[PDB]
Amino acid sequence: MLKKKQLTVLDLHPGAGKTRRVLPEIVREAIKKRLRTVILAPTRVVAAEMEEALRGLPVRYMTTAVNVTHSGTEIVDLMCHATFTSRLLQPIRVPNYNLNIMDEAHFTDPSSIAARGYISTRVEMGEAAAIFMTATPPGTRDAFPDSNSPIMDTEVEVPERAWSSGFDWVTDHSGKTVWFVPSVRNGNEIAACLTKAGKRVIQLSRKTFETEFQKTKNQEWDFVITTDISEMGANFKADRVIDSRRCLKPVILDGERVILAGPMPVTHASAAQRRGRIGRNPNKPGDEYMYGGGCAETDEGHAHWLEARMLLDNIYLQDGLIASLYRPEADKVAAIEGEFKLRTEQRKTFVELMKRGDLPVWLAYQVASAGITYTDRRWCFDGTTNNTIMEDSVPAEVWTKYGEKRVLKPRWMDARVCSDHAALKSFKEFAAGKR
Ligand SMILES: NS(=O)(=O)c1ccccc1OC(F)F
């Protein structure tokens, strides 16, 4: 599978040994054939587990999640999906890798979709080989794939708020449970309910993942309350998954604003990945998967695919050519290649608003395309009254870089900048000119 012009999907079931067994064999063969190779990990947590599976082998780890002394003799680089896309966007030269390996290639974050688009286009061009490793490739319709040991699948009503009665099965469990919730705010409510009932709960989300995941190995716990981030290779020593089967969906309305629609059903790929956290030990059959809804193709019209197109339009490929999205996921957005291509100075602003401003791709694009410079924050306060960001049922206020107290009222409203307390605190720091 290492020959040029070939894109291979390694779709072995969850827990089949794609990372610990297959990946080191591919790396040895790539080193033997002198292929300049890139290994892409979804998160810093997967990069650390990859270093254990590849230990000894000459790999250059382009992440601070691993503390290794690189000899300078490595032809295999390892980095996160977001780092690969970020380096493509930045002026820095990225080697034209002969072999491109993506682990957890089902990741739907905009930078992962862009990385898939770029790589598959290089393969279509006949310039590279690629391997996409995932049990759930784009287009999967099977929510119940094979596992290392039989799983008990039970369709049941799953609580999405605190409860006083009616769900005895949840707390009448003596093992360890991983519970997938549609949002951080929904997880806070359930974790509070479980804590009041005497349970030890750990909460996981995109912004707290590396730090809080370590607690699942360093201490005893009864529940792990997590968003969809734990569908990306996160592994637990648990015997039950409780799955609300719901997620939030970012949606662009009238090309003017972004709302977080839902909670709505997850895709079959997400349901299979959430279920896949258990049934992994062949010596422990009978792990349970309790699910509270059906699946649907909620990736169609989801803002991440439009955001991936804004990223690929601003990545150099060859002269005026622009990378297409990976074919099985290209119909998820109505977008023409090149429509988001920015001129030099606006593109640099777009990259900085994402890299340093920490803004969502769509919002970074609106600011940069309007000809606004990175440090100009007047747009955070000159929007209509209905764009007022609310905190504790009262309009959010910040002190501007001028020393003036003003109501946070962005010219373009993206619900992701205030989806939880941590997001709004970061957006207030941005509006104030603190980064
Ligand atoms: N992939 S690797 O680092 O083992 C390698 C590949 C081709 C030549 C030399 C070499 O290593 C040596 F420099 F130590």
| Rounded distance from Cα 37 to ligand 1 centre (Å) | 13
Same domain, 78 and 22: yes
Q: Quick one: 164 and 257 in the same domain?
A: yes
| Same domain for 155 and 129 | no
CA-based angle 411:422:115, to the nearest 5? 75
> 73 alpha carbon to ligand 1 midpoint, in Å?
5
Separation of alpha carbons 378 and 381, rounded Å: 6
Residue 167 has a CB neighbour count (10 Å cut-off) of 15
Q: Are residues 32 and 97 in the same domain?
A: yes
Same domain? For 162 and 283 the reply is: yes
Strand partners, 425: none
Residue whose CA is at the smallest distance from ligand 1 atom 12: 73
* Closest-CA residue to 56 (of 78, 16, 79, 28): 28
Q: Which atom of ligand 1 is nearest to the CA of 31?
A: 1
Residue with CA nearest ligand 1 atom 11: 73
Which residue's CA lies nearest to atom 10 of ligand 1? 73
Residue 81 contacts residue 90 (beta carbons within 8 Å): no
Q: Say which residue the tokens 């769509």 belong to.
A: 362
CB 76 within 8 A of CB 31: yes
Closest CA to 35 of 87, 85, 75, 82: 75
And the tokens for 234? 């996160």
Do 163 and 127 fall within a single domain? no
Residues with CB under 6 A from ligand 1: 31, 34, 58, 73-75
Instruction: Give the pair of three-digit tokens for residue 121.
Output: 């286009």
How determined?
X-ray
Burial pattern 309-321, b for ≥16 Cβ within 10 A else e, equals bbbbbbbeeeeee
**Separation between Cα atoms, residue 325 and residue 304, nearest integer Å:** 12
What lies within 8 Å, CB to CB, of 140 at 6+ separation is: 267, 268, 269, 272
The answer to whether residues 84 and 188 belong to one domain is no
327 contact partners, CB below 8 Å, separation of at least 6: 120
Same domain, residue pair 106 and 162: no
Atom of ligand 1 nearest to the CA of 75: 1
Distance 16 CA to ligand 1 centre (A): 30
**Rounded Cα distance, 76 and 61, in Å:** 9
Burial of 53 per CB tally in 10 Å (0-12, 13-18, 19+) = middle
Pairing type for strands 390-391 and 177-180 reads unpaired
Phi, psi (rounded to 5 degrees) for 212 = -75, -30
3-state SS record for the chain: CCCCCCEEEECCCCCCCHHHHHHHHHHHHHHHCCCCEEEEECCHHHHHHHHHHHCCCCEEECCCCCCCCCCCCCCEEEEEHHHHHHHHHCCCCCCCCCEEEEECCCCCCHHHHHHHHHHHHHHHCCCCEEEEECCCCCCCCCCCCCCCCCEEEEECCCCCCCCCCCCHHHHCCCCCEEEECCCHHHHHHHHHHHHHCCCCEEEECCCCHHHHHCHHHHCCCCEEEECHHHHCCCCCCCCEEEECCEEEEEEEECCCEEEEEEEEECCHHHHHHHHCCCCCCCCCCCEEEEECCCCCCCCCCCHHHHHHHHHHCCCCCECCECCCCCHHHHHHCCCCCCCCCCCHHHHHHHHHHHHCCCCCHHHHHHHHHCCCCCCCCHHHCCCCHHHCCEECCEECEEECCCCCEEECCCCCEEHHHHCCHHHHHHHHHHHCCCC
Q: Checking phi first, is residue 382 left (phi over 0); if not, alpha (psi -120 to 50) or beta?
A: alpha
The tokens describing 51, both together, are 């270093």
Pair (109, 159) in one structural domain? no
Instruction: Supply 58's token pair.
Output: 């000459």
Do 285 and 169 lie in one domain? The reply is: yes
Phi/psi at 199 (5° precision): -90, 150
Closest CA to 143 of 14, 266, 272: 272
263 and 163 in one domain? yes
Q: How far is the CA of 31 from the centre of ligand 1 (A)?
A: 7
Token pair recorded at residue 416: 């992701």
- Measured from the Cα of 57, ligand 1's closest atom is 4
Identify the bridge partners of residue 59 per DSSP, sorted by sequence position: 76
Q: Give the structural domain span for 53.
A: 7-133
Binding-site annotation, residues for ATP: 12-19
- Residue whose structure tokens are 């089902």: 106
Residue 133, φ and ψ in degrees, nearest 5? -100, 115
Residue 151 token pair: 């799983």
Pocket perturbation via mutation, ligand 1, pick of 28, 29, 31 by most ligand atoms within 8 A of CB: 31
Q: What does the alpha-carbon distance between residue 106 and residue 266 come to, in Å, rounded to a whole number?
A: 13
Answer whether 29's CB lies under 8 Å from 68's CB.
Answer: no
63 and 179 inside one domain? no
Q: Which residues contact 254 (CB under 8 A, 6 or more apart)?
A: none
CA 107 to CA 372: how far, in whole Å?
31
- Of 29, 75, 78, 98, which is best to mutate to test ligand 1, by the most ligand atoms within 8 angstroms of its C-beta? 75
Question: How many angstroms separate the alpha carbon of residue 58 from the centre of ligand 1?
Answer: 7
Can the peptide bond before residue 42 be classed as cis, meaning omega within 30 degrees of 0? no
CA-based nearest residue to 130, from 169, 91, 102: 102
39 C-alpha to ligand 1 centroid (Å): 17
Asked whether the beta carbons of 206 and 163 are under 8 A apart, the reply is no
Q: Tell which residue, 356, 307, 342, 335, has the closest CA to residue 115.
A: 307
What's the distance, Cα to Cα, between the start and end of the chain in Å?
45
Rounded to an integer, what distance in angstroms lies between the CA atom of residue 336 and that of residue 306? Answer: 10
- Measured in Å, residue 74 CA sits from the centre of ligand 1 at 6
Read off the CATH number of the domain in which 73 is found: 3.40.50.300
> Atom 13 in ligand 1: which residue has the minimum CA distance?
73
7 Cβ contact list (under 8 Å, min separation 6): 119, 120, 123, 129, 130, 131, 132
